[PDB]
């Protein structure tokens, strides 16, 4: 806020450039604009299948079963069979 004052101190060095280059002005580059419109909305069907009361209590966590079933078999032959190949 306070600093960047030093380029407004150099406004004459800008003025000789505007005298030399009149067709150029202050510029602003331009990023990722294209998916920030589509991810701004479902509009409503995402909180219809998500539906702020009912579909966090009904559909809460569903890969929590598969992850407990996953490691426990390559764990299970070693912890089950025994260290004593």
């Amino acid at each position: 806020a306070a600093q960047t004052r030093r380029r407004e101190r150099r406004a004459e060095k800008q003025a000789q450039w505007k005298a030399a280059n009149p067709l150029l002005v202050g510029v602003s580059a331009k990023p990722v604009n294209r998916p920030i419109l589509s991810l701004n909305r479902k509009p409503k069907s995402r909180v219809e299948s998500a539906l702020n009361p009912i579909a966090d209590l009904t559909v809460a966590e569903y890969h929590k079963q598969i992850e407990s079933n996953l490691q426990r078999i390559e764990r299970k032959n070693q912890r089950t069979w025994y260290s004593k190949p």
Partner: peptide, 12 residues
């Protein structure tokens, strides 16, 4: 099934 949760809550 991890992708199946990634369908059920994107985006909540």
């Amino acid at each position: 099934m991890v992708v199946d949760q990634f369908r059920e809550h994107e985006g909540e």
